[PDB]
Symmetry: C2
Subunit: 211 residues, 2 copies
Amino acid sequence: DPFASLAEAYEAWYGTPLGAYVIAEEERALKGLLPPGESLLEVGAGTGYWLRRLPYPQKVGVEPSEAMLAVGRRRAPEATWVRAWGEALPFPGESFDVVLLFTTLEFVEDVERVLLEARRVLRPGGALVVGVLEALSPWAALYRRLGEKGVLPWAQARFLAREDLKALLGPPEAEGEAVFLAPEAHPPYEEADLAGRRAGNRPALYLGRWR
Amino acid sequence: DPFASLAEAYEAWYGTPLGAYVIAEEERALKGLLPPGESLLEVGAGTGYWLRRLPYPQKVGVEPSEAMLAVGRRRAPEATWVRAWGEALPFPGESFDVVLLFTTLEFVEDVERVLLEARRVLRPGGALVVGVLEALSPWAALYRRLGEKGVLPWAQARFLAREDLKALLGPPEAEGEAVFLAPEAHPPYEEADLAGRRAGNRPALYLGRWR
Ligand SMILES: Nc1ncnc2c1ncn2[C@@H]1O[C@H](CSCC[C@H](N)C(=O)O)[C@@H](O)[C@H]1O
Ligand SMILES: Nc1ncnc2c1ncn2[C@@H]1O[C@H](CSCC[C@H](N)C(=O)O)[C@@H](O)[C@H]1O
């Protein structure tokens, strides 16, 4: 478990200027894809960052890391926390309106399997929202380097491009993307961000919604 | 040999609009860092793209790939082509005024030995000029992915950041940088480039000169 020792300070970076900007843009992008619904299931809910911020009345978080889970259920108590793996969700078919996978496929053991589970558990016409750190962004460059440099959890991550998702789930009903500036950007961040777009940067976060 | 079948189409990309822009930008940065001198040695001279374009009256190209070499000795006949590895230069010490390593370190066997050899064959007061595809740039993200997907020669490449070079050679005497736009930039390219710089992007090409 690469997250075994990262749980406690996992959100520390969001407090910094750049991190605050990144997390703000990502949430905004995510909100743009979130559909109406009653029940939500986040696979790899980690510290429950999204669980506590999403509005759905019925929220369920699946997290295999004991460390992450310890923090998550503390921070997002209103949700039901289940200790399981994406590859085998302990729920009957067609039980959720929305299933969220935010930068989790980068760490699962079997991507196709996790996606199958997500769709089974998803009810008719259910919305599957997937978010990944676009492999082609300068952020991926940083994380790939940090990974080989032995930094956790990056050393055990796999990187995906929107192309890979579309390859697996087909054409998304809707898309979203955020953070075009680079890791070493200087503020005012909005300038850096618009600049990164114009420079042709792939975004740091790609979001797709499939039914 | 990763370049075993890339020699012929190697320079092809330089024909496209972005390619044209990129390579021209690299040439400008490289020439701006090249010092005064009579003799030049390029380790991993490949297809002689740089040998065919540098002022030095006496220049030698070291290239282990026979495939690349076949093209190089042809496109840059005014230079002496030697078939050897950077790990073992067939030259006595203090014999060159300038030694050039342009995107070669990412393919050699032993980086430290290559650099030791480069320094050995350098005359007193000589200058070593290294150019690498900065590992933190969006281009690095693209090649690491291509390498992952098999694509040669990227599957065999290692990537360096200017910090890696500083750790190996110490603080350079001078530096150069080029191409802040991303692989997917859109024309007008000069704007895209200025954008990438403001975005916080790391240059696709980092150049350093040591003595
Ligand atoms: N095989 C698997 N199945 C389900 N979750 C997994 C998994 N492998 C890793 N994870 C979890 O995926 C999470 C990735 S970190 C992202 C956490 C959360 N989605 C957020 O964006 O805030 C980690 O908490 C990790 O424990
Ligand atoms: N151990 C080694 N010693 C010297 N050269 C090597 C090497 N391993 C690979 N190379 C050469 O390094 C080159 C990298 S491609 C760059 C070629 C040229 N410098 C240019 O920028 O146009 C390849 O042609 C490859 O054959």
